[PDB]
């Protein structure tokens, strides 16, 4: 390849850069067009158009973007040649002799190969520093490589800098603006009150309005979600603080599918109006999906700290309390329940007249091609209607939870999205004692495992009103059956294998601990089928 | 009771407590004379007493700490604070006003007589009426009530001789509360970095040594002789001193109950027995009859550049100044008694690296036997910076270990910490894979290690790379870990085991390499029995 001779007397060059990670060539490539002292760099539900430029005469490097809304933004960085660089030897690339310069940036070692063999300057990565030459290679940590694969002449001279810089920003504001540009954010609740105030669901529910229900401790809203959630990852974000309640409470975010005759809306209006799980104990309404009722789909199980923000005046040497707690979970596998117009709910079970303030948003982040699969709710024993007289799910003492479900088509590699916490807040109750959960499908044992968290001392600063014991521990510090005050309880993804069309049975056995002093143990388990 | 205490110069009230019907053991004796009240419990432990001065209108907490220290705290009160009338009642023949108040969520009613000229209460902190409190009712359910009232024919003075050291209430409570707590400081903002450090030949007690290329710090520490009747927590605090990345962290102890230990491996990797994979030999990862693998106490991951990169601006974020990690390790008690080598690892290649603190805490607990905890395996790459291979053998082999028990074991468990690694799109850091555990050739459990809450800890991650789709590296779901957080152990139930030989294996369908990118798994297991 006779590179120097081919681009002697060219009016400009086009360099194509490819990137590789430890040998493996990554997709997509950068075209760097050089003409005089100007450089343009380009690649090759609406995305910003992103470009980079350099002016070697004025010595500024530029980020540039046209946002979906057609606002132009840019950020300009002046540079000096060779800033932060230490000579680090010689090499050859595409037959051209290169100085190599080394710099380190945020712990990375970066080597920049650059030639003076041909009369053109440019670099694909100005942000690591700009050598006075044409950059043929950038090596990060010996492994991550962006290298010129080709250099070709341009016959015509050409101005490359854009028409406008539009709105000039510093680099951090620019990067944040472009990064968030393709993100859909659906605000749902913003510091909304959840409290016990006997509130009841109206007989008219309009779109976009918060309603309070199950005695105040459920808030519901019908929200317009993207039509399709394909090619997105989806996260739930909650922010909470106490507005008066001192205690660690059971929190849940859920959606209410209405694809059958009855939905959890019908249960919120009137618990006894929907089908029941029929335990040896008695009948427990609203907990299992059936042919004509869907249980609510849980998105996130969380537990409040003891009196966040509200009790920050408590003094405990060594502790510095937080002003609020956040919770963020990926819920991408529930995408099919998170498209179109959807009833969304949040729950914090409590008895306080002022209670808690909770925020909730959904974020949809652009992702590689990602099919929406299906998610079908099977069961949910969270006591969402505790403040409207729902029984505690105490039937595990003598019974398994049992469901039936039907598939129209076979499903490969099905999974149960399974949220479990144990409850019974004394020394022999299931909050504080390890118990297995055993899942059965179509008469076979799928898995037996113990739900347990032993990291709860980590979140001490989220718990200003946690009781301090005479042995030195705080209530919030204790290990518990799969939850910690102030944190998310993460789902288990239980592999079910391939399921044939037709009906199936599934059950959950938990050796729940016996009552004591009138107090009961109980389990809050939810399960959605992912297929 | 009236009748009997006309012209008494004082009274003794015995208070019993009850919970949901059930009368609690042992009781409170309240001595009242004049305007003074002394409270003591009716027969290691600090001595606790409470006083009231109705003349000065203060209530007092008082204690003698085991080590002969007297502390006290004074809280002025006003009569009837928080209190609203809630009617009439009778207790042991005396006419009571009932007052109501609420405190930190709770309902409290307080029955109090003026029928006899004595004032006192066993619970001044719920409020002090201008009479004698016969009954305190907290959420209808928590009850302290007078069982006996006895006259004193003579006056006494009841406040204590010394107040010792006078504190605010919160400083009092913290002081008494931490009285029985043993805290062993281990490391204090100690550097963990890559500086080619090597383990010395002379190793004294109570000193910090650097090893495995600088990324291991070790100390031999004097732990309680017995950890019976304690719950035990490990507390770590970390920040970057230069390293921008999310690193694998581990706190471990080195048992030396057998011929060779992990200390021999730290000094020289190839000096200890190996796991023999199809692939190759992997030293130090499995216990044998002459070698114990290190016992992991806690698996954690650092944020991306805590403290050091806090100058990074990301709208809506407010960075933490350090990250703490606290785990309960009570079931490893047997490895946390006597003289013990403790280590911390943060695998990194940085010249300055990290700073890490570590303490153990032993909190008094109800009767609790020390059980046993035997290490079986540990594939954390503790010696990464001294040339240890990545545990990549899962691609074609299971991890297998054999062990022998001398006696039957009831309700055995595997204390199992797993994380998956391989930090690209097709690597096991970011793809769900089962771990299947086998005992004596039978499947115990198959389960998917996964964390999908990592977005929660964004503020612990100032140097996390921000992608063009709006997510940050630290936000992504991963195989059982999040940058800035603890990975919690699985407790896998193995059942009763017979004395004699057993095998355990772990199968993981590890992803295939892509060029020089390899997936690998860091798994550790200690038998609890």
Author numbering:
A (entry chain A): 25 to 68, 84 to 570
B (entry chain B): 27 to 69, 85 to 570
The authors write:
To investigate the structural basis for specificity in the Bacteroides PNGase enzymes from group 2, we solved the crystal structure for B035DRAFT_03341PNGase to 1.95 Å. The structure consists of two domains: the catalytic domain and an NBL domain, which are linked through a flexible α-helical linker. The catalytic domain consists of two eight-stranded anti-parallel β-sheets, which is a consistent structural feature of PNGase enzymes described so far. The active site residues that are key for activity in EMTypeII are conserved in B035DRAFT_03341PNGase, with G388 occupying a critical position to allow the accommodation of α1,3-fucose. The available space for this fucose is particularly apparent in comparison to PNGaseF/EMTypeI. In contrast, the α1,6-fucose points away from the active site, so is not an issue in terms of blocking activity, consistent with the biochemical data. The NBL domain in the B. massiliensis structure has a very similar fold to the one in EMTypeII and is unique to these two proteins. They consist of 11 β-sheets connected by short α-helical regions and disordered loops. In contrast, the B. massiliensis PNGase from group 2 (B035DRAFT_03341PNGase) showed good activity toward plant-type N-glycans on HRP, with negligible activity against other structures. Overall these data show that B035DRAFT_03341PNGase requires a core α1,3-fucose for optimal activity (i.e., plant N-glycans), but that the presence of an α1,6-fucose can be accommodated (activity against insect N-glycans).
Here we used a functional analysis approach, coupled to detailed biochemistry and structural biology, to reveal a pathway for the degradation of plant N-glycans encoded by the human gut microbiota. We describe the biochemical characterization of five CAZymes and two crystal structures to provide a degradation pathway for plant complex N-glycans encoded by the human gut microbiome. In this study we characterize the likely pathway for the degradation of plant N-glycans by a prominent member of the human gut microbiota. B035DRAFT_03340GH92 is then able to remove the α1,3-mannose, followed by B035DRAFT_00995GH3 to cleave the plant-specific β1,2-xylose, and B035DRAFT_02132GH29 to release the core α1,3-fucose, leaving a Manα1,6Manβ1,4GlcNacβ1,4GlcNac tetrasaccharide.
